[PDB]
Scaffold this active site. Sequence first.
Site, PDB file in Angstrom:
ATOM      1  N   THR F   1       0.861  -1.226  -0.126  1.00 23.82           N
ATOM      2  CA  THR F   1       0.203  -0.069   0.016  1.00 23.82           C
ATOM      3  C   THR F   1       0.755   1.338  -0.134  1.00 23.82           C
ATOM      4  O   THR F   1       1.741   1.382   0.777  1.00 23.82           O
ATOM      5  CB  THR F   1      -1.014   0.108   1.193  1.00 23.82           C
ATOM      6  N   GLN F   2       0.668   2.272  -0.888  1.00 24.81           N
ATOM      7  CA  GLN F   2       1.295   3.654  -0.967  1.00 24.81           C
ATOM      8  C   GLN F   2       0.355   4.538  -1.149  1.00 24.81           C
ATOM      9  O   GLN F   2      -0.899   4.240  -1.334  1.00 24.81           O
ATOM     10  CB  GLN F   2       2.497   3.321  -1.830  1.00 24.81           C
ATOM     11  N   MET F 107      -1.379  -6.508  -2.234  1.00 25.71           N
ATOM     12  CA  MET F 107      -1.687  -5.326  -1.544  1.00 25.71           C
ATOM     13  C   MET F 107      -0.621  -4.164  -1.733  1.00 25.71           C
ATOM     14  O   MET F 107      -0.254  -3.514  -0.839  1.00 25.71           O
ATOM     15  CB  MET F 107      -1.904  -5.586  -0.076  1.00 25.71           C
TER      16      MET F 107
END
Lengths: 196, 196, 195, 195, 222, 233, 226, 211, 204
Positions: F1-2, F107
């Site tokens: 996740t970013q 993810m």
Amino acid sequence: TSIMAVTFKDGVILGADSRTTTGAYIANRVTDKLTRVHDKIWCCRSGSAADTQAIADIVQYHLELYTSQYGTPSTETAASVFKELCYENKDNLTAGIIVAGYDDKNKGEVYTIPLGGSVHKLPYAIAGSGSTFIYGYCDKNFRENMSKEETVDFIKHSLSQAIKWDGSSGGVIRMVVLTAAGVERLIFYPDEYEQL
Amino acid sequence: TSIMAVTFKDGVILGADSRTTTGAYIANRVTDKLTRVHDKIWCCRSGSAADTQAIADIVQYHLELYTSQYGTPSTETAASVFKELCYENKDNLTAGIIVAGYDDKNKGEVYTIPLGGSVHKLPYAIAGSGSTFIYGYCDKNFRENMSKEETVDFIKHSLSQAIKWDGSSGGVIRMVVLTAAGVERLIFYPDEYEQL
Amino acid sequence: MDIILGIRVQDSVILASSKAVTRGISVLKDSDDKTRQLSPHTLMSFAGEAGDTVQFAEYIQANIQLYSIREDYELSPQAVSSFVRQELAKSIRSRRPYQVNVLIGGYDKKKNKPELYQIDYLGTKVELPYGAHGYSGFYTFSLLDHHYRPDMTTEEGLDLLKLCVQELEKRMPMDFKGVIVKIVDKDGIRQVDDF
Amino acid sequence: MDIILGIRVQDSVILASSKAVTRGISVLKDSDDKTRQLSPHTLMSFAGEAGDTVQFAEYIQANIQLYSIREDYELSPQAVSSFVRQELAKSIRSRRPYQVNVLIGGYDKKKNKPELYQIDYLGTKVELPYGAHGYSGFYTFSLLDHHYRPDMTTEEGLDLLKLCVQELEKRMPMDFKGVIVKIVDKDGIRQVDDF
Amino acid sequence: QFNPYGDNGGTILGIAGEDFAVLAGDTRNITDYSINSRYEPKVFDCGDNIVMSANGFAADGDALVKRFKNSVKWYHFDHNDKKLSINSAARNIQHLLYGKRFFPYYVHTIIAGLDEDGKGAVYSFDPVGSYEREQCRAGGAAASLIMPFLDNQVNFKNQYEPGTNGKVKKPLKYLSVEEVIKLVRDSFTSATERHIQVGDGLEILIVTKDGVRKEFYELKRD
Amino acid sequence: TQQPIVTGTSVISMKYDNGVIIAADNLGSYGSLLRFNGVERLIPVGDNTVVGISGDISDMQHIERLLKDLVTENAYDNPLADAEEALEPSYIFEYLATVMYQRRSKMNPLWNAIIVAGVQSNGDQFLRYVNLLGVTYSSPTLATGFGAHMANPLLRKVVDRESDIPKTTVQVAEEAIVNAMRVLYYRDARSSRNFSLAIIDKNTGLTFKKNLQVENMKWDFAKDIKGYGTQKI
Amino acid sequence: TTIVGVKFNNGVVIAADTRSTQGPIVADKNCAKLHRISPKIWCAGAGTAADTEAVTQLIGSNIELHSLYTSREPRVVSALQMLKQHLFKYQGHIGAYLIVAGVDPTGSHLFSIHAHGSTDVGYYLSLGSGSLAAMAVLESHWKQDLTKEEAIKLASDAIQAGIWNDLGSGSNVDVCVMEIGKDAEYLRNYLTPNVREEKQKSYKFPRGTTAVLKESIVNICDIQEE
Amino acid sequence: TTTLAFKFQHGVIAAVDSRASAGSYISALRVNKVIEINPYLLGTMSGCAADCQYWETLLAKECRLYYLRNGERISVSAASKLLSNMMCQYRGMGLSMGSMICGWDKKGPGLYYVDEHGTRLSGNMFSTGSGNTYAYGVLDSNYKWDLSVEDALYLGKRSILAAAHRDAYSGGSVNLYHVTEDGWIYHGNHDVGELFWKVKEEEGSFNNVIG
Amino acid sequence: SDPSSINGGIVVAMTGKDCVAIACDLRLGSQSLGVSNKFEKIFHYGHVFLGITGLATDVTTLNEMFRYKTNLYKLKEERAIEPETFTQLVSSSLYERRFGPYFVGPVVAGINSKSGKPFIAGFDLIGCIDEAKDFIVSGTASDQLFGMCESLYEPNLEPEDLFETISQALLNAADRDALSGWGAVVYIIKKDEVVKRYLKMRQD
Ligand SMILES: *[C@@]([C])([C][O])[C@](*)(=O)[C]([C]C1=[C][C]=[C][C]=[C]1)[N]C(=O)[C]([C]C1=[C][N]C2=C1[C]=[C][C]=[C]2)[N]C(=O)[C]([C])[N]C(=O)C1=C([C])C2=C([C]1)[C]=[C][C]=[C]2
Ligand SMILES: [Mg+2]
Ligand SMILES: [Mg+2]
Ligand SMILES: [Mg+2]
Ligand SMILES: [Mg+2]
């Protein structure tokens, strides 16, 4: 922080302020933000000091080992190593690095590597919290193929304004000149640049 | 938004861009941000359009009623009314207003009223999201007692750079000239200012 | 589960454990035996989170039964209680701890003494004349502090235990459906079928 | 408080209400009467948040007693239930609502009919042959659905009620300390002292 | 924060006949209030006289279908080109879905075909693999709009025989393929009117002993 | 996740009778700051495919390198690398679509929206979309971000369904694309005047146009607009 | 919702689609979004439908009384000022987003107003979920000195863009033309491009199909004489 | 769901409803909540449909392997444990599965309650699901060990009916099973709509409801 | 928690040829628990009918309120309120509670006594009017009702045909909703006669 790298006729110059803050306290007013990764490849650091130091140390190691095997690396190659570290570890890093170097073949080159780990080759680059205040000034005043003295004045005036408006920036203005002649360090004190 | 007010020899000029955004969508590209509260007292609006319109409408009402009783109000008086509204309702407002006006006694005056409701009398003022990018340019290029043509050029070049770097700014550049001669509206289109 | 009591008298250890099992708003069972025999002279009662209690108890039971076969020898109550404590102390820092509180009632055949050990889910061990877990002690310890002697008979121990259960049945909001009582002495483990 | 039941038979209404009152982990009282006589032929039982229940009930009682004196006339159970509903509906949108659920059992002397009204704290009114509040209905309504007839006697109503309480005592986790039972008929309100 | 799921709308419908089966679905693909495509096939011929549709989050739907098609290919390799029966496919799909029990394929899946006695068969799944053979099933955005209509018009629910007044039910006479296709087209026309994510086009796949046939019908594009 | 840092805005495209057109502006935004003005977001793969990418630029440069490496790898032990066994648009897309869906499943997505435009071996037009979620779809017109909301409506007036494709010439299609880019410049706060445009035709091949500008803009009517309601001067 | 406003030579025109939604469900397929504030002042609303109606009726009522008090025909700036001051007071909690247009003794006017109380001026405007699709059409085709016929075309084309490309918009196109020196003409269902096709089957049931328990006559009449 | 199961003189009765929900929406009207693990073993289902199906279908795999290795049918006690051990592996991971394992083995008839916490309880009577309280009411007041097969089947049937009526998330139809030492015997699918009216008239119950 | 789905229930209204029909289920629950099978959700004030779904305390409160208001209307006006007028009254009364609303979904049905024109209308909890020609739906099975009505409905149905159509729409929608059912009522309304029918349905 206020940092910038500018290409000119004979090569490239890196410039930076000297202030490091912990909130509103100035932890160090004489910081050296212009850091060497190779003889004539230097970088300007912004963001987490821990992250940027750790990265520049790793890059210096990679380019030292590159040199031992394949000879002098290009500025593009240096930027790629910075990028690879910044991009692949973007979740755990907060680093905004400007890479500047001089070849005899390619002459002066400037690469900027913002937060995400993207690379952008440019004639000149600005970064750090204080850069926001000089986008207008730098765009209006930059020219390609300036002289050494013209480029030093451009950086001096620019960072002067960045320092003037950004509280996170200040102290002395350090510069590093990269040409065929060699490597020249410069310094400019408050009493000189404030009165511009 | 990019707004500014500049005093010069014959009076004062207000300048602004014309872009209004809702996030990244441009809800109106030809907005008029230069608003009149009295014959020769105008203001530049930044922040919540709802808040700034409601305030300027109330101020126009107060100055209309002031005029009916006590004659032509000063620019200082206008700014005080703006301040009183912005300061006393600071919890429920997001308004950054620049007040500019011309008297025959006081000549051109500029007051800026940032978020908190403080007042600052200045030779020139800049505000809005796009102002950050021209602090350096405007500081280096402003002079006191400029001519009308010099001042128009200063505002044009300045907002040009603000528009160039700020995505929240754009469209046309509107200006309002306030002198003893009267009230002159100006407009400058993209094809003119982009090539500067 | 809810209430588990223990009392060490002259020549035996008595463990009392509630019979109720509840899921959602419904009492599924009113005859549940919250105990496992670890060895012929060592009984462990338990209470805590659903599922974990039986799994933990059976796991301990298997380990002690393995020790008994390997050495052809019954571990002392003290040794078993120490083994159990270490397992719970090991468990509390695991990814998912076993949320189980226990009482270990045993008769040491070497010393000819009854022994009661109270161990909570953190691995907190104490040897006591009488013990409980959860809120049980809040209601019962005042009675035990008053009436308990170390020279009590098994029959006197049961009478004092009846008084404790009556107090619980009066002042606890929850219906725990009575208790199953078991006695641990020199002759082994037996259940009191009328209580 | 916890459990309140109601059942309307041929010629009377029967209300059963738990006796327990709990503060913290302690049952302070096991003989509490969760009811108020609103008029000679109208009884209201209640259950909800601590304090609010009695305050609300007494406030309703006072208002009906005021009406009775002013007009020298007893309001119908329907009229009283409507008054109560409006007060709760008024209350739910107040700054701090009264968290009270009620059953109103009354004998209408005009129509010669028993009447049972169920009203929750939101002001939700329903006339029913039998009713309950909270979780009480989850356990008891299946029995009532099966055994209830409209021509039942008062004695048959009490027997069906005993079956409901027995089911509650078996499958509820909470000990509600039995119930006080009251009967509302043409002759007025009386309490069943042995249940 | 990154959301790995999305909603591409659409609606699907499976009906089992006596000796045939149909699987239908609209061809509209959406995100939020925008249209991605007016024609994006959603029901697929998976081989061995089986048709399949996984409706909801298209990325997960395409992955599932792709994987099941692959399971059919390997079934042939491993078991001497044996035909995969509809009941065997259903059980296989259960395991595909439950394999991601803790990071689900966010789709409602439906397959249709013929059982081993040649009779029409529809199977219906949830996102985590629970399945059943059914006579009638609508899935997706307008599933709640369509299913009651099918309870009424396919299984004759709440319908009785006139004159008896609720004593005798309507007898469960079988439906022809022509009759089923009418109920499918009327189901989608009705869903298109009252559901914003349904429209553009309708594609029906009919399964008989002779093979898999396709029929396409236009729907309102608003 | 970013979170995306340096971003590119809309990519727009459509089919026409003999091929496909795709376009995207040259801006790299840093939030509201219009930071980089010389960014190329259309990336050719061979002479039959152009991949247009919006979203995070660092991830775009990563994808750019994957494609460059894909061409290299295809040539290995392949005497027909510049003929029958050359990379097709369909091969390139499916590869990217596989990568995008794998990354979202871990993810750790490539924060992009991608349109692969090209022409196949048999002359067929190829135009398909994929994004950070691994969601894929095809349509006579495709657009990302703001383009989906503002360009598609205009492009769908030219090619509303499949049967309109043979009736649409390259001149009409290019005109519609250029007009769409102007509209986006009027209305997208993160757009630039400068853009690139690529045409892939089954006859004339790949035409890549750089340094295009939005022109014929209407601003004159702004002079008449005064105040926000009651103001006359 | 898709709504637009377009100025022309001698007046102004507004238009809107006819779909109202609850979530993804279409509640009404032929909703009337074009509201009347005064005879020659019409508005159209997006956002919270109840708020757009309530705020339109309130201001229209006060505008009528104002017109009677002053013996003058109502002005668009009056409606605008009254609307924004009301909306501002409620700080955006009244979710009314409107395009206001009309003609009065001063001339022709076109304004937009947002829920927080901000107003805008323009020659062409769009609001609602379909605003971007409509604005794309307006930015492509609008020009200065439009005729009445050209403006109606531009307005309805802009609405159609929203109907086809925005899922929140659909069904028909309503229009209202306000020309100077004339009565305003309200063109309800000016376009009808979304008629439902004939169903393949009739679902009319046999009489007696539904099971019944009790029948009774309901007394709706009052108490009777004699 | 509402499921129940109880031991009696002539084996064990198992009765379940047939509804499935997705919020207020009734997703399925006739789902099979009993699994035929083997000719002498049944499993009821309550909780997550998916879960119930996967793990009880897997239990049947594991019970079949027991027969192949040992040449003897698995006991009800062992089968219930294998299932409870499967639950303990996914301990805390969010499964939702309530089930009764019913059957006949060497010890006679057997009945075990097993849930997702790894709980394993032996007993004569159990009921799981959103409507278990309603079923328990009828069961507790009418249950005897001396019930006849005919009266027992009816009790299980009537108990589900009670729950189907009051519980909004229970209904559809009733599935009956009777487990003997020769195996389980299915006693049909019974629509609740029809059963309700039938039971109302014949029994005289549900007086408050009008029909 | 969600007030609009605690008690459950549904209402539907349809127009026909010189007639209207309005119908509702009879359930009242506390979430999963069924409490009453006699909770009628349709009321009438003169010849104007009103169905209300949602939170039952507000259903009862609003009925009492509109009875109050229509009784005063009649005394002052010396005539019964018409459907068009009542619709506006309902809308006004709901919007006066804009920031503390009744959690309901009202539906109006009736025939104008003067014009003879059939009329139906629906609202949201805050007052927005939906004046449809064909049908109006409300409740916890509104999605199901939209699907049934949209497919089964056809214009100009005769009273006895309309009865079958509305009944089948309601019944089958309720049988796909956990919170609706437990009986149903249908009103068939003509200019000067109104028939009320209780339907037989599954009681689960
Ligand atoms: C009661 C109805 C209460 O839920 C009962 O428990 C049933 C059990 C059941 C067991 C086996 C097969 C079918 C049903 N439970 C459900 O229906 C569950 C309830 C539920 C929803 N979320 C949730 C639940 C339970 C526990 C945790 C979380 N419903 C479901 O699991 C949903 C997802 N199932 C379906 O939608 C199914 C569909 C559609 C479908 C199924 C299941 C099976 C076959 C075809 C289609
Ligand atoms: Mg400084
Ligand atoms: Mg302890
Ligand atoms: Mg649409
Ligand atoms: Mg039910």
